[PDB]
C-alpha cells in the first residue's frame, strides 16, 4: 500500500508546540538509560521518529509531559526489540521477565536488576504522579495485561484470526497508550462514563484501527492479518490487503459515527458541566491520538 | 438445552451453605425485604451457586450464595416502573465502586453494607495485584447501571447493546471468584493467554445470549429481529445458534489447552493452575445452564 494512502477521516491531526524542547528531554532519558537504548543502532532509533509520535499522538500536553509520552514510546519500541531474538522463542524466560516487570506495576518488586526494570520503574513512577490510587489500579492491571501476553508471543515464535487479534490487543499495549490520556491530560474520567457503552466502543475501536493498517503497512517487510485473510480467502495479495485496510476504514467511520452521538449520550445521563467536559476532552484525546497515529505512520 | 460435552456437577455443602446464606439475609434485612418471600425463593440462588462453584467449601459456597443474593437484590432497586434517574443511579454507583478501592467514607444504605461485608470477605487470602483487578471489575459492574437506567427511556443498537450487557451481567466478577473460591491465583501469562483470554469471553458471553432468548426492548432477540426484518422464530435461532457456535469454540480451544501450555514450558503447579482455572469456567458454564433450563 501507497505511504500515500491514508485512512478517510472528517478531522485532521494536530501537532504538539512543544515537540522540539521535548525532544531534548527524551534525549536526556536515552542517555540515562544508555544500556536499554544499547540494543538497537542510533539509526535504527532515529529512523522510527518516536518524538514525532509522541507529538502527534498526544498534540496538547506539557512539554514535560510530552516528554514522557516520547520516553514511554521509546520504551515500547525497545523492548519488544529486545525480543526480536533467540531469546525471543524461549517462552520460560520470557515469562520470567514479564513477571518481575509486572511486579513493578503492582509495586512488590524487592530490587531492580536490569536496564528494562530500571527503565520501567522510572517511566511507571513518573505515570503515576498526580493519579489516584484508583485510577492506578486499572493503570496497573493494564501494564500488567501488556507483559503477561509476550510469552505466549515467543510461544507464536500461522495463527487463527480471532487468536492472532487477541494476542495484537496485548501486545500493541493500546488500553495503557489510553490511560495516558488521562495522565497526560490531569484528569480522571467519571466512571459511568468511562463504562457507558458509546465510549467503551470508541475506545476498542480506536485500540484496535492501528493494528490493522499497520499489518497492511508491515506486510511486505514481514503473525499479519494480510497474511491470515490471503490464506483464509485463498485471494490475491493486493485483495488481502484491501480487505484489512477496508475494515479498518469501517471501524473508523463507526468511530466517527460513535462521537456524533456523544452529545446525546451525555444528555441522557443528565451529566453536569465538569462531567461532560472530562467526557469531550477524552473522547476528542482518543480522536486526535488516532488522527495523529494514522499520520504518522505514513511518514514514518 | 444448550449443548455440552461434560455436564454440571453439584456442591455437596449446599445445605449447610443456605442455612448460612439465610443467615445473611436475616443480617441484611432492609436489603433483602426489598422484595417478596416467594419471589426470592423463587430464584433459588443457593442452587445456583451450588451448581457454578460445585467444587467450595461450605464456607465458600456461602459466600457464592450471598453474592448472588447481592446481585439480584442491589438490581431490584433500579427495576422500577419507569426507571431511576441515571445521575442518581450514578451516585449511587459511584459510592459503591468507592467501598471496592477503598475510598468510601462512611457504609450507609443497605446495599452498602452488603456490599462492604461481602468486599471484604472476597478480598481475604488473595494478594493486593489480584485486588486491583477484581476491583476494576467491580467499579465496570456499578459504573454500568446509568447506562442502563438512560436505556429505559428509550430496541437499542446490537453492538452497543452487547458493549453494555457485558458489564451488567458481572461475569468478570464471576471468574474472579473462581480464584478466590478455588484459593489460587493464575500465572500472569495463563491469564492473558490467547487462548485462555477467549475462553473467558465466549464463557461470559454464552449465559446472556442463552438468558435473553429464554426471557422472551433491550434483549438481543428483539434487536436482532428489527435488524434482519425477520420472524421471531428465526431471530430467537439466530441468537440460540450463536451461543451453541461459542460454546464449540469454547471446547475446541479447553481441547487445545495442553498444546497451549507446552508451548510456554508451564511447571506443574503452572499446569494445575491453568487446568483448574479452565476447568472452573467450564463448570460454571455446564451449571448455570441446567439452574437456566430448571
Given at each position: 500500500m501507497s505511504d500515500d494512502t491514508s485512512l478517510e477521516l472528517p478531522f485532521t491531526h494536530r501537532r504538539n508546540p512543544h515537540q522540539t524542547e521535548a525532544a531534548d528531554r527524551h534525549l536526556e532519558w536515552l542517555q540515562r538509560h544508555r544500556e536499554l537504548a544499547a540494543v538497537v543502532s542510533g539509526s535504527t532509533y532515529t529512523g522510527w521518529d518516536i518524538t514525532e509520535l509522541a507529538s502527534l499522538v498526544?498534540?496538547?500536553?506539557?512539554a514535560e509531559d510530552l516528554a514522557l509520552a516520547a520516553d514511554l514510546m521509546g520504551f515500547y519500541f525497545l523492548f519488544d526489540d529486545?525480543?526480536?531474538?533467540?531469546?525471543?522463542?524461549r517462552p520460560e524466560q520470557v515469562a520470567l521477565i514479564c513477571e518481575r516487570l509486572s511486579a513493578i506495576a503492582h509495586g512488590t518488586l524487592t530490587a531492580v536488576t536490569s536496564p528494562s526494570e530500571r527503565a520501567f520503574a522510572d517511566l511507571w513512577r513518573r505515570i503515576t504522579l498526580g493519579m489516584t490510587d484508583r485510577w492506578r489500579a486499572r493503570a496497573a492491571c493494564n501494564w500488567e495485561y501488556y507483559f503477561a501476553c509476550h510469552p505466549a508471543e515467543a510461544a507464536g515464535r500461522p495463527p487463527d484470526r480471532e487468536g492472532y487479534l487477541t494476542l495484537r490487543r496485548g501486545t500493541a499495549a493500546m488500553e495503557s497508550i489510553f490511560d495516558m490520556i488521562e495522565r497526560l491530560g490531569h484528569f480522571e474520567v467519571p466512571q459511568h462514563v468511562m463504562h457507558h457503552p458509546l465510549f467503551r466502543q470508541l475506545r476498542q475501536l480506536a485500540a484496535d484501527i492501528p493494528s490493522f493498517t499497520n499489518d497492511v503497512r508491515s506486510f511486505a517487510q514481514e503473525a499479519n492479518l494480510v497474511m491470515i485473510v490471503r490464506r483464509d480467502r485463498c485471494c490475491s495479495t493486493a485483495e488481502a490487503c484491501a480487505v484489512v485496510w477496508d475494515e479498518a476504514q469501517r471501524m473508523a467511520d463507526r468511530f466517527c459515527d460513535l462521537r456524533d452521538q456523544l452529545p446525546d449520550a451525555c444528555r441522557s445521563m443528565s451529566l453536569d458541566p465538569a462531567q461532560r467536559l472530562a467526557a469531550e476532552r477524552y473522547a476528542d484525546g482518543m480522536a486526535l491520538w488516532l488522527a495523529g497515529y494514522l499520520h504518522w505512520e505514513s511518514h514514518t
Open positions: 498526544y498534540p496538547e500536553s506539557s529486545q525480543f526480536d531474538s533467540p531469546l525471543g522463542r
